[PDB]
């Protein structure tokens, strides 16, 4: 039982308060105060529903040295997440009910962020044979994806959507046409040529998204149930336009954007620093600007991390040999609260919506609002400014493309159904 006084309330519906929030019995008991032995002065802070990440690579099983559920779910709660979706590109890939159950059992024993695991669309994510979606859902899978991997065979993706539709399992795709991407290490264009690096055409992403939207129409026709397509990390202006028009046309497609594609651009590669090597690549300012507009108009349904950790040593190899990936679980919200809300005037309720309601709806889960009687899975954000300090990360990837960045909006308290899983009141 906890009482948070003089705090602002913020969920997708809007900003309210200051108010005194009484939490107990795992729920929000009152928004008009009450009595409690544990009292938190939330002056200047705002309370929001616990966040939910749709795209996190936790490196377990198989590559625990990079990350594992212990470090990953801890980093998650420190980042304000009370719910998280793990990707299946592990060693070996999560494509069986037992693998799904194992992850869920461990996440329950640890009792930090809620694990909602994703399973592969195809066995070993090799893109040839569909997995047993029915059994996977029964075990707890919330979405199917071969992510990491692209889906080159349109027939498999189509069949995948048909298998998933009646199960209510969204199919999330890493939309890049491998044929046109070739083995680009950064965004293709003038800068790539200036740096003498093989480019990955942003059109490679537009091409695959365009294809998939037509494949989705096929699923709509052939399936009795409504299929669900989710475009992962969307990074280009053209890709955004494609999704915007598909939505206008009424297609059941959703999309997410990552913290790095919203704050960084290809320009960051002028040093050949692998810390900025990611898939899909960082794009141009024009693309980044378009995404911000996409966040506002609703074309983008959620902000997902695509938390992809590796070891510092690996990230210290030559740019061409270094792995693709950026970690961000612990900095995602403060980063965007600072760069988008404070510096660009981006609406706070909309930003919070993108970390809550949006992600939950993508999965088909009911929204969690700050209202009396609601489950007390919340996060308290502080305006205090402090730099991103990798050495202090709970995540094992002790590095960051935003290292040193002075940000406000860091979580100082995270609760999962009333239980304190993270506290840094300061
Ligand atoms: Zn991906
Ligand atoms: Zn990914």
XYZ file of C-alpha atoms and ligand atoms in Angstrom:
428
model
C 0.000 0.000 0.000
C 1.511 3.271 -1.173
C 0.405 6.912 -1.421
C 1.829 9.151 -4.146
C 1.017 12.791 -3.423
C 0.753 15.872 -5.619
C 1.492 13.938 -8.806
C 0.260 14.474 -12.355
C -1.630 11.636 -14.030
C -1.026 10.787 -17.673
C -2.496 8.070 -19.883
C -3.738 8.016 -23.502
C -6.911 9.856 -22.446
C -5.084 12.963 -21.255
C -3.241 14.706 -18.426
C -4.955 15.264 -15.074
C -4.037 16.237 -11.523
C -1.927 17.057 -9.538
C -3.598 14.400 -7.419
C -2.956 12.067 -4.498
C -2.985 8.448 -5.662
C -3.613 5.623 -3.196
C -2.385 2.206 -4.314
C -3.136 -1.032 -2.487
C -4.409 -4.579 -2.961
C -2.608 -4.491 -6.296
C -4.940 -1.798 -7.637
C -5.379 1.966 -7.768
C -7.680 2.345 -4.766
C -8.199 6.092 -4.949
C -7.318 9.207 -6.937
C -8.560 11.428 -4.119
C -5.978 10.442 -1.531
C -6.133 8.145 1.463
C -3.981 6.870 4.310
C -0.765 4.903 3.927
C 2.444 4.385 5.892
C 4.523 4.624 2.715
C 4.181 8.085 1.200
C 5.934 9.299 -1.944
C 6.184 12.987 -2.757
C 5.491 13.062 -6.494
C 5.675 16.834 -6.911
C 6.750 17.684 -10.442
C 6.505 14.047 -11.502
C 3.825 12.283 -13.499
C 2.402 8.800 -13.161
C 1.674 6.660 -16.210
C 0.437 3.129 -16.864
C 3.285 0.611 -17.008
C 4.913 0.517 -20.442
C 4.880 -2.467 -22.804
C 7.677 -3.164 -25.278
C 6.692 -4.991 -28.461
C 10.234 -5.724 -29.594
C 13.037 -6.828 -27.259
C 15.864 -9.294 -27.921
C 16.709 -10.907 -24.587
C 19.543 -13.332 -25.737
C 18.197 -16.250 -23.857
C 18.428 -19.146 -24.564
C 21.797 -19.541 -26.248
C 23.576 -16.201 -25.931
C 23.273 -15.310 -22.253
C 26.655 -13.576 -22.430
C 24.983 -10.800 -24.456
C 21.888 -10.675 -22.233
C 19.479 -12.940 -20.431
C 16.097 -12.746 -18.712
C 17.796 -11.738 -15.438
C 19.458 -8.633 -16.866
C 16.854 -8.010 -19.563
C 13.705 -8.004 -17.438
C 15.482 -5.901 -14.804
C 16.551 -3.376 -17.439
C 12.935 -3.444 -18.581
C 11.446 -2.391 -15.230
C 14.143 0.260 -14.814
C 12.998 1.582 -18.184
C 9.401 1.752 -16.991
C 8.179 -1.456 -18.632
C 5.810 -3.742 -16.726
C 5.281 -5.891 -19.838
C 7.666 -7.056 -22.554
C 7.596 -9.138 -25.741
C 10.729 -11.224 -26.337
C 11.824 -11.925 -29.891
C 12.439 -15.510 -31.030
C 15.784 -15.295 -32.872
C 17.602 -17.112 -30.065
C 19.976 -20.115 -30.169
C 18.021 -22.126 -31.101
C 14.976 -20.040 -32.141
C 11.850 -20.095 -29.984
C 9.597 -22.238 -32.186
C 8.153 -24.864 -29.829
C 5.590 -24.777 -26.996
C 8.195 -26.016 -24.503
C 10.632 -23.226 -25.377
C 7.816 -20.716 -24.897
C 6.816 -22.245 -21.556
C 10.404 -22.284 -20.281
C 10.769 -18.548 -20.906
C 7.417 -17.818 -19.273
C 8.197 -19.936 -16.201
C 11.484 -18.174 -15.561
C 9.919 -14.748 -16.056
C 7.338 -15.667 -13.463
C 9.791 -16.854 -10.927
C 11.865 -13.637 -11.279
C 8.808 -11.417 -10.770
C 9.966 -8.396 -12.648
C 8.468 -7.254 -16.058
C 5.641 -9.562 -17.407
C 6.964 -11.754 -20.243
C 4.736 -12.150 -23.293
C 6.810 -14.177 -25.603
C 6.826 -14.148 -29.420
C 7.522 -17.339 -31.371
C 8.952 -17.901 -34.842
C 6.655 -17.861 -37.881
C 8.672 -20.679 -39.464
C 10.744 -23.500 -37.970
C 14.183 -22.252 -36.955
C 13.086 -19.046 -38.693
C 14.460 -20.523 -41.920
C 11.395 -19.320 -43.826
C 10.270 -22.655 -45.263
C 7.902 -24.439 -42.868
C 5.255 -22.806 -40.694
C 5.414 -23.450 -36.943
C 2.543 -24.958 -34.889
C 0.867 -21.619 -34.094
C -2.048 -23.284 -32.318
C 0.188 -24.998 -29.779
C 2.440 -21.936 -29.523
C -0.479 -19.682 -28.607
C -1.657 -22.242 -26.061
C 1.802 -22.132 -24.475
C 1.592 -18.346 -24.249
C 2.931 -16.849 -27.499
C 1.406 -13.439 -28.283
C 2.763 -12.917 -31.796
C 4.674 -14.647 -34.525
C 7.802 -13.307 -36.217
C 10.895 -14.487 -37.977
C 12.425 -11.106 -37.095
C 16.119 -10.868 -37.615
C 15.202 -12.703 -40.628
C 13.527 -11.370 -43.487
C 10.378 -13.241 -45.195
C 11.492 -13.739 -48.795
C 8.855 -16.293 -49.800
C 5.579 -14.364 -50.144
C 3.681 -17.652 -50.205
C 4.954 -18.631 -46.772
C 4.016 -15.245 -45.324
C 0.559 -15.524 -46.880
C 0.049 -19.009 -45.448
C 1.424 -17.688 -42.164
C -1.187 -14.946 -42.023
C -3.930 -17.468 -42.756
C -2.734 -19.759 -39.956
C -2.497 -16.834 -37.533
C -5.750 -14.996 -38.296
C -8.131 -17.336 -36.402
C -5.728 -17.536 -33.462
C -5.670 -13.774 -33.041
C -1.875 -13.875 -33.335
C -0.427 -10.866 -35.166
C 2.322 -11.596 -37.669
C 5.173 -9.112 -37.289
C 7.629 -8.761 -40.148
C 11.122 -7.350 -40.596
C 10.292 -5.649 -43.887
C 13.401 -5.449 -46.056
C 13.820 -6.946 -49.520
C 17.051 -8.931 -49.109
C 17.564 -8.786 -52.862
C 17.837 -5.047 -52.980
C 19.368 -4.662 -49.516
C 22.327 -6.789 -50.626
C 24.786 -6.537 -47.919
C 24.418 -2.908 -47.067
C 25.937 -1.879 -43.734
C 24.308 1.637 -43.633
C 21.639 3.658 -45.432
C 22.250 3.889 -49.179
C 22.718 7.318 -50.725
C 25.273 10.161 -51.068
C 26.648 9.749 -47.537
C 27.232 6.032 -48.092
C 29.188 6.887 -51.247
C 31.135 9.617 -49.433
C 32.115 7.117 -46.742
C 32.884 4.357 -49.229
C 30.480 1.914 -47.581
C 28.073 -0.583 -49.200
C 24.601 0.937 -49.036
C 21.301 -0.617 -48.000
C 18.652 1.179 -50.100
C 15.754 2.582 -48.081
C 13.739 1.451 -51.098
C 14.536 -2.097 -49.990
C 12.243 -1.469 -47.033
C 9.559 0.279 -49.102
C 9.623 -2.568 -51.613
C 8.996 -5.257 -48.976
C 6.324 -3.244 -47.142
C 4.530 -2.585 -50.440
C 4.648 -6.300 -51.253
C 3.404 -7.346 -47.812
C 0.429 -4.984 -47.932
C -0.752 -6.732 -51.109
C -0.153 -10.111 -49.439
C -2.297 -8.882 -46.542
C -5.135 -8.177 -48.976
C -4.821 -11.798 -50.073
C -5.157 -12.970 -46.464
C -8.180 -10.707 -45.984
C -9.888 -12.370 -48.941
C -8.968 -15.962 -48.111
C -9.428 -15.880 -44.339
C -12.772 -16.063 -42.490
C -11.039 -14.312 -39.585
C -9.346 -10.925 -39.809
C -5.563 -11.305 -40.226
C -3.130 -8.983 -38.455
C 0.100 -7.652 -39.946
C 2.562 -5.673 -37.838
C 5.446 -3.833 -39.486
C 8.433 -3.785 -37.157
C 10.860 -1.156 -36.834
C 9.485 1.197 -39.700
C 12.287 3.605 -40.572
C 11.500 5.352 -43.860
C 9.276 8.143 -45.087
C 8.199 6.044 -48.074
C 7.430 3.074 -45.845
C 5.382 5.350 -43.609
C 3.403 6.627 -46.609
C 2.662 3.038 -47.650
C 1.325 2.196 -44.192
C -0.645 5.442 -43.952
C -2.465 4.692 -47.219
C -3.076 1.065 -46.292
C -4.674 2.209 -43.046
C -6.767 4.786 -44.883
C -7.891 1.877 -47.058
C -8.995 0.031 -43.930
C -6.321 -2.679 -43.929
C -5.664 -4.368 -40.537
C -2.002 -3.367 -40.370
C -0.063 -1.774 -37.513
C 3.433 -0.323 -37.227
C 6.104 0.520 -34.662
C 9.092 2.876 -34.588
C 12.278 2.610 -32.519
C 14.017 5.189 -30.303
C 17.054 5.273 -32.595
C 15.120 5.767 -35.831
C 13.317 8.618 -34.063
C 16.444 10.362 -32.749
C 19.441 9.376 -34.898
C 20.251 9.551 -38.624
C 22.790 8.160 -41.097
C 24.984 11.163 -40.246
C 26.048 9.366 -37.068
C 28.093 6.984 -39.253
C 30.689 9.579 -40.259
C 33.055 7.915 -37.764
C 32.457 4.315 -38.804
C 31.372 3.668 -35.200
C 29.589 0.259 -34.963
C 27.471 1.685 -32.141
C 25.317 3.154 -34.909
C 25.196 0.017 -37.057
C 21.624 -1.274 -36.925
C 18.966 -3.040 -39.023
C 17.227 -1.463 -40.708
C 19.847 1.345 -40.938
C 19.546 4.833 -39.516
C 18.015 6.958 -42.281
C 17.983 10.598 -43.331
C 16.661 13.572 -41.362
C 13.770 13.606 -43.831
C 12.845 10.052 -42.839
C 13.209 10.800 -39.124
C 11.069 13.907 -39.485
C 8.406 11.921 -41.342
C 8.300 9.335 -38.547
C 7.692 12.033 -35.945
C 4.703 13.168 -38.007
C 3.662 9.523 -38.259
C 3.746 9.266 -34.466
C 1.411 12.258 -34.264
C -1.170 11.380 -36.914
C -1.486 7.830 -35.615
C 0.059 6.027 -38.590
C 2.578 4.604 -36.131
C 0.795 2.631 -33.412
C 3.648 2.191 -30.996
C 7.231 2.865 -30.059
C 9.182 -0.388 -29.758
C 12.825 -0.627 -28.719
C 14.221 -3.411 -30.902
C 16.584 -3.764 -27.951
C 19.375 -5.779 -29.620
C 22.339 -6.195 -27.244
C 25.785 -7.633 -28.008
C 29.080 -7.558 -26.099
C 31.177 -4.395 -26.035
C 34.037 -6.339 -27.621
C 31.894 -7.301 -30.609
C 30.797 -3.686 -31.003
C 34.465 -2.727 -31.064
C 35.266 -4.693 -34.224
C 35.609 -2.943 -37.576
C 32.323 -1.498 -38.832
C 31.994 -4.170 -41.539
C 32.515 -7.051 -39.093
C 30.598 -5.674 -36.106
C 27.082 -6.980 -35.390
C 23.926 -4.973 -36.141
C 22.050 -3.678 -33.116
C 21.294 -1.020 -30.526
C 20.277 -1.591 -26.869
C 17.778 0.866 -25.345
C 15.400 -0.690 -22.813
C 16.573 1.533 -19.939
C 16.770 4.780 -21.929
C 13.895 4.535 -24.428
C 11.354 6.628 -22.527
C 13.604 9.296 -21.012
C 15.287 9.638 -24.418
C 12.028 10.361 -26.237
C 10.514 12.355 -23.381
C 13.536 14.635 -23.705
C 14.069 14.734 -27.472
C 10.400 14.671 -28.488
C 8.282 16.108 -25.681
C 10.572 18.671 -24.059
C 12.554 19.798 -27.130
C 9.894 19.448 -29.885
C 6.689 20.007 -27.940
C 5.410 16.515 -28.787
C 2.214 15.853 -26.738
C 2.922 13.959 -23.492
C -0.321 11.982 -23.481
C 0.385 10.862 -27.032
C 3.943 9.836 -26.133
C 2.639 7.838 -23.174
C -0.045 6.304 -25.393
C 2.704 5.072 -27.731
C 4.304 3.200 -24.807
C 1.028 1.862 -23.426
C -2.318 1.651 -25.164
C -0.732 1.490 -28.605
C 1.470 -1.570 -27.913
C -1.318 -3.304 -25.977
C -3.781 -2.863 -28.845
C -1.256 -4.230 -31.331
C -1.301 -7.464 -29.329
C -5.055 -7.312 -28.862
C -4.746 -6.690 -25.120
C -7.110 -4.336 -23.285
C -5.669 -0.902 -22.426
C -4.537 -0.109 -18.883
C -5.659 3.319 -17.666
C -5.016 5.426 -14.581
C -8.455 5.012 -13.031
C -9.752 3.786 -9.676
C -10.013 0.010 -9.575
C -7.398 -0.453 -12.296
C -4.463 -2.854 -11.965
C -1.597 -0.968 -10.313
C 1.025 -1.648 -12.974
C 2.452 1.854 -13.206
C 5.602 3.895 -13.540
C 6.506 7.219 -11.938
C 8.579 9.570 -14.108
C 10.841 12.301 -12.717
C 11.816 15.546 -14.515
C 15.318 15.375 -12.991
C 18.050 15.492 -15.638
C 20.891 12.966 -15.559
C 23.225 11.548 -18.226
C 22.959 8.134 -19.838
C 25.622 6.154 -17.964
C 26.237 2.705 -19.528
C 28.308 1.498 -16.572
C 25.125 1.847 -14.509
C 22.945 -0.195 -16.894
C 21.288 -3.360 -15.627
C 21.515 -4.640 -19.209
C 24.772 -6.476 -19.914
C 25.479 -4.342 -22.984
C 27.510 -1.635 -21.239
C 27.541 0.839 -24.122
C 25.077 3.138 -25.836
C 24.850 5.363 -28.906
C 23.292 7.899 -26.505
C 26.026 7.574 -23.867
C 26.472 10.868 -22.042
C 23.186 12.340 -23.254
C 21.595 14.415 -20.478
C 17.956 13.333 -20.239
C 14.940 14.000 -18.078
C 11.930 11.730 -17.648
C 13.686 8.741 -16.081
C 11.493 6.263 -14.172
C 11.971 6.542 -10.391
C 9.375 3.953 -9.410
C 7.897 0.991 -11.280
C 5.075 -1.183 -9.974
C 3.725 -4.472 -11.299
C 0.250 -5.043 -9.839
C 1.202 -2.946 -6.826
C 4.553 -4.624 -6.227
C 7.670 -2.443 -6.239
C 10.019 -3.900 -8.867
C 12.108 -0.764 -9.329
C 12.709 2.242 -7.101
C 15.201 5.079 -7.455
C 13.477 7.939 -5.652
C 16.383 10.289 -5.175
Zn 14.349 -6.579 -37.244
Zn 14.622 -6.973 -33.977
